[PDB]
């Protein structure tokens, strides 16, 4: 009696998933990178490790990060000596910080995105929350539903322990949710806090130490939907095609474990080398079908894992130096905010394009690419189209 | 130049997401319920707690579980006294078990589902992995890709720390992935291991103790896709509509935290009561649009959190006793395997329907419902259509 084909046709959306709003937020405590070595070696009781401090100073000087925003403060660290040691039982204390801070910072970013969107929050049908800092049941998706006053029947997707490529992951997921469901409006929130990874220095663990020079806190929120209401909603970028892959010869490049001592970061291979060796294949998969071969003719968003990934990709492809400008600006002002970074870069790019009177939100260009890099070695690819003005 | 509408039309699927294969697996160690109180009170050094053992015996007697399969054995527990205590630092030992066992068990279920499906594992485009048992980076999704030899470009969705309603969640997610992407074939794996939640008994924490009578291990895998190739692929169930909601007046009903002592299960409200009070609303949302109001006229799959949820739902709606038969058979043979449970119940239902020559895979009925229940209080609803024969 009942027609499923009629239901399916009536249930789905028509057009491409579109980013309709972007909002960001960071902890209030601003930490300058120029004075970080001294602050970090003092608060971790490591001032006597002069040679290790010199190695950390070089890591900070090479980071291309001017400052980072941190939930952790001198006061909080003085109350948590176990967090200041390289390896002490401290997950409960860290979890108590991030179970609250992740949704707190996420709400700030989400309220800003909802304000830009300008539509009733009761029209948000799906919620994607992504974090690599802490886990809990009910999760941060339930907390944000409560904190934002979303409908109780919002459809939630709680992405925990994702890693640095997950800015691409949440876009890949939001695309399918928006495109398959007529009327769907997806609130996407990436919120990353370094309280679960902060730890003291160890001269036999230099891989762990590099994380201390790079990771910073931040949240970004998006509204994503298909079939925008003309002259009411305002498209910023459209998603057109996505991919995720595991690079060959990359096993163990980035291994991150959640233990009693918190989240521990282990590095085993040349990440910049692997990314730059495999980025061209990811570009031809994405762009050959569109007839695009000139990689300077598209706008660029790349996860700034570190500056060497950016430099090596730029050199490999012969990208003009300006291609990575928005990416490098976010790295310089905020450091590596894990999954949230690429969403901050989208916001920077569209705001600079607008401010500077370019013709599209993607630096005056039509087509663009967003890349996420992280554990596995995983590469996420999202092909974007800009919007006029 | 490039038409995004053309791309979008060529990129999406046409028909409803369909379950094309189901495979399950459990650890080899079979644990009888009749004698579990003695086993559990001996291994946890609690044999002198006579009254508490009595309370546990009653929980096991009322559980309606005959046996469970568990990775944990007497030998593994004797080597891990911190896991045998009610509350001792033990997450590292538990993670070392589950980071391996979750993908191992998932692999066995996935291989079974792929064998039934019959098509090359190179045609699997998307992979959803769900567990409430441990977390790691790269996740269990990466581990399964490697273990099964899936393509490196399989698109992965790692659902960690989800909870007992996530059998519904993975179906809700797989539906959009399959329907929005032409040719997509989604391998869905739920794999749950009780090594992160096992702990000793405490007479002031009877809510934790209830979990020790109910939780068991298991993995279930599905192949989901739209547009099945007729007579090559074999549809089992179709998904038609989904929902997720948070029941009113249920805050804190089920809070589960991942701490240095592992995963701790708490209960603060009457779950059977909340579920039975809110199930009608969930049914009307799903079935009023289809013109169905007789809930005995549809086939049923309910997460068997405990037998009281089933009994109270049955009594509330006046379901005939036979409606919950497949659900109760899975509870009897395997216990509560968290997210995997509802997928085992789909398997039992279609296998008994096919074995017994009923007219459809849903007990000879056309329309059916699958419910997941868990933290938040969250209710997941999936509306299914059976397949002839």
Curated annotation (Swiss-Prot), chains A, B:
Pathway: Secondary metabolite biosynthesis; flavonoid biosynthesis. It comes from the Eukaryota. Pfam families: Chal_sti_synt_C, Chal_sti_synt_N. Its EC number is 2.3.1.74. The active site is at 164 (acyl-thioester intermediate). It catalyses: (E)-4-coumaroyl-CoA + 3 malonyl-CoA + 3 H(+) = 2',4,4',6'-tetrahydroxychalcone + 3 CO2 + 4 CoA. GO terms for molecular function: naringenin-chalcone synthase activity. Homodimer. PANTHER family: CHALCONE SYNTHASE 7, HYDROXYMETHYLGLUTARYL-COA SYNTHASE. Belongs to the thiolase-like superfamily. Chalcone/stilbene synthases family. This is Chalcone synthase 2. It comes from Medicago sativa (Alfalfa).
